[PDB]
């Protein structure tokens, strides 16, 4: 096989122009390697950008350009967008199969919306009680959730996810407070508290 290489990652800014190279371990990349660049977004969302070394596909912002620059095949992004943040995979033809690059990952402030949900009747019946706190619409993707019961902070029984980039180019996450039907009724209120970029947001619900 002919290993294809790319740049691990690239931090860019809006408006700018970035160039991604694609170097082949077999030697000089030519028009016969029918270089193809593919854009990959969260959740295995692949999209065609350039094929046949330099042909833009239908629905591709002209800011995207493919061309052979030296022994390499490169992708040029003239006019960065926040949405243009993704993983760029180039693929070179090697007679009878495409060989892909491990991918170049390019990088390019919203308060989170908190949503609490009380235990499900059905779940309570099982003497269990799961408090759900679904956090959304935030960027940068970096928050700190804390739970409070009767204004007092609780450490045990709390499970919080990892931020996940959403199609709207914003992060989301979820936190769980595992309690017993007992504990759930034994208190006056539960507060899901999120701290993001300097300020705090908190919601509460009362077993009452």
């Amino acid at each position: 096989q002919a290993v294809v290489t790319q740049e691990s990652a690239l931090t860019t800014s809006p408006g700018e122009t970035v160039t991604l190279t694609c170097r082949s371990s077999s030697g000089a990349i030519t028009t016969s390697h029918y270089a193809n660049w593919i854009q990959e977004k969260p959740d295995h969302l692949f999209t065609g950008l350039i094929s046949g070394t330099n042909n833009r596909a239908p629905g591709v912002p002209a800011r995207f350009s493919g061309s052979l620059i030296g022994d390499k095949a490169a992708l040029t992004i003239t006019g960065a967008q926040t949405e243009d943040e993704a993983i760029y995979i180039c693929a070179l033809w090697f007679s009878n199969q495409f060989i892909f690059g491990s991918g170049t990952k390019v990088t390019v402030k919203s308060s989170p919306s908190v949503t609490l949900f009380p235990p499900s009747s059905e779940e309570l019946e099982t003497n269990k009680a799961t408090l759900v706190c679904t956090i959304t619409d935030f960027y940068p993707g970096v928050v700190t959730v804390d739970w409070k019961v009767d204004g007092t902070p609780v450490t045990q029984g709390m499970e919080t996810t990892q931020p996940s980039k959403q199609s709207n180019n914003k992060y989301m996450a979820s936190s769980y407070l595992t309690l017993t039907a007992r504990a759930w009724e034994r208190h006056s209120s539960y507060s899901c508290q999120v701290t993001h970029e300097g300020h705090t947001v908190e919601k509460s619900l009362s077993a009452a």
């Binding site: 094929s51 070394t53 495409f98 491990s102 949503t115």
Partner: protein
């Protein structure tokens, strides 16, 4: 208006063999190529095989020439990729794309189907409180607790409710996953209209539709 939709997650024992499928809509099934790529746990895409539907010309590579067969059903616009004698090695996400020629190819793809080489979930409806019903938009939810392994497929109203849907990342706690999915609708829409979340756990042949009531 082009879309290639693939089948669902697949859990298989070693030595067995799965049957994946990519169906096309929006173009000449027969005058277009169909390739399959796969992505192992973090190992870049690997080329597998390709097939030309309207001329049953399937081309493989050394690597997959043995465990990979590929058929087309020109009468349903579906392409079956079958893998034989499964190994942990094969655990990956198989996707599918189309192509006209070496100059124009791999523009559109499928969401890809995950293959893994078990305990079903408990689904609980989540009715909105004062911190979910918020004036014009009310948001219902579904707690998909203690299932294994990943993934679960959560849908709302059999897919009719496509916008405002938010499935959050699962969390692991004692070899058991638990996730939550929410959907937002106009406060007039519910309880008025029915809202049901359809959870599916391929790994355990389990499917649960839970009506979310007030």
């Amino acid at each position: 208006e082009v879309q290639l939709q693939q089948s669902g997650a697949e859990l298989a024992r070693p030595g067995a063999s799965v049957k994946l499928s990519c169906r096309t809509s929006g173009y000449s099934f027969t005058t277009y190529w169909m390739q399959w790529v796969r992505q192992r746990p973090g190992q870049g895409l690997e080329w597998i095989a390709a097939i030309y539907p309207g001329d049953d010309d399937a081309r493989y590579t050394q690597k997959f020439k043995g465990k990979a067969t590929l058929t087309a059903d020109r009468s349903s616009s579906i392409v079956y990729l079958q893998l034989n004698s499964l190994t942990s090695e094969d655990s990956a996400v198989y996707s599918c794309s189309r192509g006209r020629s070496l100059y124009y190819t791999m523009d559109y793809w499928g969401q890809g189907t995950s293959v893994t080489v078990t305990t079903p979930p408990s689904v609980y409806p989540l009715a909105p409180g004062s911190a979910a019903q918020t004036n014009s938009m009310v948001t219902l939810g579904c707690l998909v607790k203690g299932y294994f392994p990943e993934p679960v497929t959560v849908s709302w109203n059999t897919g009719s409710l496509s916008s405002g849907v938010h499935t959050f990342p699962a969390v692991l706690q004692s070899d058991l996953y638990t996730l939550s999915s929410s959907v937002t609708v106009p406060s007039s829409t519910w309880p008025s209209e029915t809202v049901t979340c359809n959870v599916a756990h391929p790994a355990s042949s389990t499917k649960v539709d839970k009506k979310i009531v007030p």
